[PDB]
């Protein structure tokens, strides 16, 4: 809801949207193991976690 997202750098607005998703990601990093998550990053990211979950 905080509309203070607009800034000068293209990645500075990009890190802010990641901060919105770490609230969901902290649920998802809690239950999944440490074996598929880096296995699905060399071949944390969000998309590596759902099939491990």
């Amino acid at each position: 809801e905080d509309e203070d997202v607009t800034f000068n750098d293209i990645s500075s607005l990009s890190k802010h949207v990641d901060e919105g998703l770490d609230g969901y990601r902290d649920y998802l990093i809690k239950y999944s193991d440490r074996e598929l998550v880096q296995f699905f990053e060399n071949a944390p990211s969000i998309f590596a976690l759902l099939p491990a979950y």
Partner: protein
């Protein structure tokens, strides 16, 4: 002729006599067949020998190993119960190899145990070692830290020289003369 302990084991009675002979009192070891040995002491020495039984906590408990809490005959073996029976045998083989060095009479090694690294998503951590040794006297026991540290540093995958703690000391003065019988 006052008995004070009975039913002991062979290695327990050799630890009781060598404690009493250090304090100028002599004891008699009497076998009883199936019911173990028994130690008797003289009547003027009974008051001192009970006080040294209380102080030194004799008779000694059998020495415990980590592989005794997880017997191999169990039907279900966890990864925790396999990792603990592995480290509890590396810990005995390393302290059995430390006794064949030049000057060591006894030693005791402790490997840090890791259990909670396998089941959850936490990565494992660096392993720590610790050692103890008793050297024959007349030896320069300050220069022999680097030989034990060098021997221990390459017996695991990744240890540093400040994660190994070696505490060693020289042995006590030797006891060679007899106690002597208490005359009256």
């Amino acid at each position: 002729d006052k008995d004070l302990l009975k039913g002991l084991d062979q290695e327990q009675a050799n630890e009781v006599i060598a404690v009493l002979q250090m304090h100028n009192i002599e004891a008699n070891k009497i076998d009883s067949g199936k019911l173990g040995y028994s130690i008797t002491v003289a009547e003027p020495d009974f008051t001192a020998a009970v006080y040294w039984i209380k102080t030194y906590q004799l008779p000694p408990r059998p020495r415990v190993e980590i592989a005794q809490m997880f017997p191999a005959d169990s039907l279900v073996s966890s990864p925790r119960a396999e990792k603990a029976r592995l480290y509890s045998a590396i810990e005995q083989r390393l302290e059995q190899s430390l006794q064949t060095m030049e000057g060591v009479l006894s030693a005791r090694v402790h490997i840090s145990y890791d259990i909670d690294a396998g089941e959850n998503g936490r990565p494992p951590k660096p392993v720590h070692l610790s050692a103890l040794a008793v050297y024959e006297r007349g030896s320069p026991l300050a220069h022999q830290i680097s030989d034990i540290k060098r021997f221990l540093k390459n017996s695991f995958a990744d240890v540093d020289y400040d994660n190994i703690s070696v505490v060693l000391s020289e042995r006590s003065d030797a006891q060679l003369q007899a106690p002597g019988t208490p005359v009256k």
